[PDB]
Each structure stands twice: as C-alpha cells, then as structure tokens.
Design a protein around this ligand. Structure first.
Ligand SMILES: N[C@H](CCC(=O)O)C(=O)O
Ligand SMILES: [Ca+2]
Ligand SMILES: [Cl-]
Length: 250
C-alpha cells in the first residue's frame, strides 16, 4: 500500500502525522506546493488548476490512492481530481463531517466551522451538515491562523488577540471543526479559549477513521516509509516534517 498525500504546503503534515501513526500504509509520498502556498486566500479556478498540476506530479510514483490533506483544495478540486485520476482520491471534508456527526450524535448540538476564506466560501461543510439535519451551524474564516502557525506562534498574547478578534461575541460550540491543516497546531489554545465543553474535530484523525470504515486495511507492524517533495525548498519541508511528526525516534 503506497499512497500519496497532497497539501498546498507544510500544513498537511498534521494529516500525514495522523496517517503515519495509524500505521495504515507501507509507504507515503508527501507533496507540498510550497512555492505557491497559501491556497486559502485565492480563487476557485486557481486552486483547481494547481491541484491538477499536483496530480500530474504524482503520476511518476505508482500510488494506489491519493489523499488531499488540504481543506481548501478538498473544497473545490475533488470533482476535477477524480475525473482525471484512475485511483481513489479522498479529501478531508467528508471525513470531517462524519467525525463531527460521530462526536456529537445529536443534530441539535452547536457546530462551529473554522477554515480559510476559500473553504468557508465553498459552503461544503455547511452543505453536508445541513443535509444530515445539523442546522445549528456557524462558519467562520480565521485566515490569520495559517501564517501565525507557520511563524511558530501556537500560544501567547499575540494568538489570544487573534482568537478574540475572530471569536468576539460568537457562541461557544459543542464542536468546532478544525477545517484547516494548520489548525491542530493551535489545538490547546483553541480548546483553552472555548473550554472543555467544546470538542475539537481534527481533520487528520477524521480521514483516518474514514478510511478504516471504507477500506479493509490491516494495521501495519512497521511505520511507513515517508517521502517528501515540494515545489520549493524541500529541505525546509523535511525539517518541519521532522519536528512535527518526530521522524527522529528509534
Ligand atoms: N492547507 C490549507 C491551509 C493553507 C493554505 O491556505 O494553503 C488548508 O487546509 O485549507
Ligand atoms: Ca476516477
Ligand atoms: Cl470539491
């Protein structure tokens, strides 16, 4: 089982970590479009175009399956990606919704979706939740979280002001969907901001359960062999990857 993992840049490592630790695969190819990141503040057409180029890049690897780690790309490009690919392609949005339903199991509970501008604008989360009868939803772009995470700001007064700027006079949700690859890095601060009543829905953990229910995968004895590629400064991606996944252990 050799799969591909696509993200707009470095943030998708949160999803990779999930897939890595779940021990589902022999081998994983991670590609980050670091030369053109972010996607979240750009337009639909551009996002779809960039995703198709990524699929082109993965053509050289003989992968059995492609996971779109990026929520933004998952929001707009799945249709095109699936029309072109001849192997299963999965995004994280569908998975995120069902993990939310599984966490709450009560259509009356309150849900907050936080993501990039483009992901929110797609209304893809909203659409899936509503169709399942979950109508107590709020969707909110919190875009500054991405470059803050990338600058290594995961807590403190700077981040507090960021949350208060985004979360002023909004209600505390029974669940918040971390609908952005970067957001698990802010998991503790977010949870501290909202309190323990709010369940955090993690996209990476979500896609893992999603695959386990959809596929028949034996749990591996050994960790997958990881491969890192990037459109720019691949060593920087690898450096970040080493820190976030801790690829320095035994
Ligand atoms: N990877 C993107 C966040 C960074 C970007 O804007 O490209 C996402 O999950 O939505
Ligand atoms: Ca197909
Ligand atoms: Cl889509």
């Amino acid at each position: 089982m050799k799969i591909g993992v696509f993200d707009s840049g470095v943030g998708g490592l949160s999803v990779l970590k999930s897939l890595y630790e779940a021990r589902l695969f022999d081998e994983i190819i991670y590609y980050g479009d670091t030369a053109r990141v972010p996607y979240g503040v750009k337009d639909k057409d551009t996002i779809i175009k960039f995703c198709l180029e990524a699929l082109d890049f993965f053509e050289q690897f003989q992968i059995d399956m492609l996971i779109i780690a990026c929520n933004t790309a998952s929001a707009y490009a799945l249709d095109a990606l699936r029309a072109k690919a001849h192997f299963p392609v999965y995004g994280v949005i569908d998975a995120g919704v069902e993990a939310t339903i599984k966490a709450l199991h009560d259509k009356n509970k309150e849900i907050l979706v936080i993501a990039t501008k483009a992901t929110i604008k797609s209304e893809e989360y909203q659409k899936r939740l509503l169709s399942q009868g979950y109508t107590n939803i709020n969707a909110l772009a919190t875009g500054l979280f991405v470059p803050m995470v990338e600058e290594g700001i995961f807590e403190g007064d700077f981040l507090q002001s960021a949350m208060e700027y985004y979360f002023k006079n909004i209600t505390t949700p029974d669940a918040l969907i971390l609908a952005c690859t970067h957001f698990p890095l802010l998991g503790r601060s977010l949870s501290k901001y909202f309190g323990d009543k709010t369940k955090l829905i993690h996209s990476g953990d979500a896609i893992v359960e999603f695959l386990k229910e959809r596929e028949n995968i034996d749990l591996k004895n050994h960790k997958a062999k990881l491969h890192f590629y990037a459109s720019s400064d691949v060593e920087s991606l690898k450096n970040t990857a080493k820190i976030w996944l801790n690829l320095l252990r035994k």
